[PDB]
Amino acid sequence: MESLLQHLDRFSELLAVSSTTYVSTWDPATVRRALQWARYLRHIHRRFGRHGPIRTALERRLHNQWRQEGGFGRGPVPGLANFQALGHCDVLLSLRLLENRALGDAARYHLVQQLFPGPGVRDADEETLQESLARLARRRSAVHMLRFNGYRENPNLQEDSLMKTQAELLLERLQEVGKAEAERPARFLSSLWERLPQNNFLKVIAVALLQPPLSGEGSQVLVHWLLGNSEVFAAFCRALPAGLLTLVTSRHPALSPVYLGLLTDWGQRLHYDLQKGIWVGTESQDVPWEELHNRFQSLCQAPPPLKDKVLTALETCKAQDGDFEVPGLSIWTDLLLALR
Amino acid sequence: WVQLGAQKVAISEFSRCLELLFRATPEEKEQGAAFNCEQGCKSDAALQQLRAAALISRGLEWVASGQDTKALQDFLLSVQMCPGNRDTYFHLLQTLKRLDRRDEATALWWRLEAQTLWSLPLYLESYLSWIRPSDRDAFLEE
Ligand SMILES: [Zn+2]
């Protein structure tokens, strides 16, 4: 338990400098020592990896390492990711050493000769390193092939395959910070928002909310982050399709009456023009009629728990702007005619 | 309904009159389908003079319910519709002289002086004659 800490942090230092381009000093001694230590991590992972206080203690050391580095200002090191990354740490290190261009010739020679002796040890007891890099190169190729001769950008994004994946990575990554309790998940989600491609990001979250439970503490964190920050949630409701947000609503009703609030705020920024039979926006960035018709049509094409809420939220909005029963006048008249 | 004093059902019927001017055309003799109004009910002059009028009749209800932005929009539309009725310019300039006179009002003054009956039917000229205010040129020399 205490013996493992000095082993693992020394390996983590060596892993992080694997990426780094100082490689002149390195020799077969360094390489051999690296892969022996990596064997021991893989050994530990097999021996007392499962159902131990040791596992949870190493996870505290993981997340403590991963939060005191942070990934801000100095150096955004990925690092050895999590508990299953101990089961192929060797591979990570060896891959990083190949990617360092300044990796010395003699070291690389000793390296590749030690990774790939050849088929002299086709008989090996432990599912060995060679076999791990082969089955990788295979999966890799398999992915690439399947992407370009098989892969489809599904229109029910809740059933997409890349989305589904990126989503479940973010949920693992929230579960870890939840049990660590170091910084609040809000800070993590805010740093995301700041750093990365936003458009892509949001579809992730959307799918996140509908993924059934795996161990929905994650889902319950995302609703509270969003409702905390109204400004991003404005671009959420803006940036997706209707069906995605309709299902967001039927599942997490803590979102429904804020999003109805948004439409209630965008419709009231329209005017009829009599020449062209249409409501339109003043500004370029204001929802066109068809967009808003879509989104309301969706809320209506839904379970009864939401349908009565949105129907009444419109009828009360109509009475508020004069209960006319012809268009020209009340945007909300319009919608309600359009939905029959 | 305005003479019976009921803003709602007036602004109903003015709006429904403006829908059957604009999501329909009266000049569809692709099929001469029956006996039909040659003269009275097809003149472009009779169409632009039904439109200006309906927007006036509705823009004054908007002043009466106290929504003078809506009123301004229908009055501004009517000058775009028929620039030779002058009742439109009077109602628009009265609204502008209430709120924000100077540049807007003068911009329309110079237009009136730039500007300076063919066959409109009767029921309609008599209706225009009916609503028009006495104190109209009095306002336009101010
Ligand atoms: Zn006729």
UniProtKB/Swiss-Prot annotation, chain A:
Q: Is RNA-binding found in the keyword set? A: no
In Gene Ontology terms, what is a biological process of this protein? DNA damage response
Q: Where is this gene product found?
A: Nucleus
Q: Which GO terms describe its cellular component?
A: chromatin; cytosol; Fanconi anaemia nuclear complex; nucleoplasm
> Would the keyword DNA repair be found if you checked this record's keyword annotation?
yes
- Show which residues constitute the signal peptide: none
The UniProt keyword set, sorted, is:
DNA damage, DNA repair, Fanconi anemia, Nucleus
Q: Where do the TM regions start and end?
A: none
Q: Name one Pfam family in it.
A: FANCF
Concerning InterPro entries, the annotation shows: FANCF (IPR035428), FANCF_C_sf (IPR038505)
**Could you tell me which cysteines form disulfide bridges?**
none
Please tell me, according to the UniProt entry, what happens when changing L329A. Answer: Strongly reduced monoubiquitination of FANCD2
Highest taxon of source = Eukaryota
Q: From the record heading the sequence, give the disease linked to this protein.
A: Fanconi anemia complementation group F: A disorder affecting all bone marrow elements and resulting in anemia, leukopenia and thrombopenia. It is associated with cardiac, renal and limb malformations, dermal pigmentary changes, and a predisposition to the development of malignancies. At the cellular level it is associated with hypersensitivity to DNA-damaging agents, chromosomal instability (increased chromosome breakage) and defective DNA repair.
PANTHER family with a match to the protein in the record: FANCONI ANEMIA GROUP F PROTEIN, FANCONI ANEMIA GROUP F PROTEIN FANCF
What does this gene product do? Answer: DNA repair protein that may operate in a postreplication repair or a cell cycle checkpoint function. May be implicated in interstrand DNA cross-link repair and in the maintenance of normal chromosome stability.
UniProt subunit comment: Belongs to the multisubunit FA complex composed of FANCA, FANCB, FANCC, FANCE, FANCF, FANCG, FANCL/PHF9 and FANCM. The complex is not found in FA patients. In complex with FANCA, FANCG and FANCL, but not with FANCC, nor FANCE, interacts with HES1; this interaction may be essential for the stability and nuclear localization of FA core complex proteins.
Q: What's the protein name?
A: Fanconi anemia group F protein
Q: Which organism is it from?
A: Homo sapiens (Human)
Gene transcribed to yield this protein: FANCF
Curated annotation (Swiss-Prot), chain B:
Q: What does this protein do?
A: DNA repair protein that may operate in a postreplication repair or a cell cycle checkpoint function. May be implicated in interstrand DNA cross-link repair and in the maintenance of normal chromosome stability. Candidate tumor suppressor gene.
Q: What is the effect of changing G84R?
A: No effect on HES1-, nor FANCA-binding
Localization, per the record, is: Nucleus; Cytoplasm
Q: Which residues of the full protein are shown?
A: 463 to 611 of 622
Q: Identify the domain of life.
A: Eukaryota
Outline the TPR repeats, range by range: 1-24, 52-85
Quaternary state and interactors: Belongs to the multisubunit FA complex composed of FANCA, FANCB, FANCC, FANCE, FANCF, FANCG, FANCL/PHF9 and FANCM. The complex is not found in FA patients. In complex with FANCF, FANCA and FANCL, but not with FANCC, nor FANCE, interacts with HES1; this interaction may be essential for the stability and nuclear localization of FA core complex proteins. The complex with FANCC and FANCG may also include EIF2AK2 and HSP70.
Q: Which organism is it from?
A: Homo sapiens
**Name of the protein described by the UniProt record:** Fanconi anemia group G protein
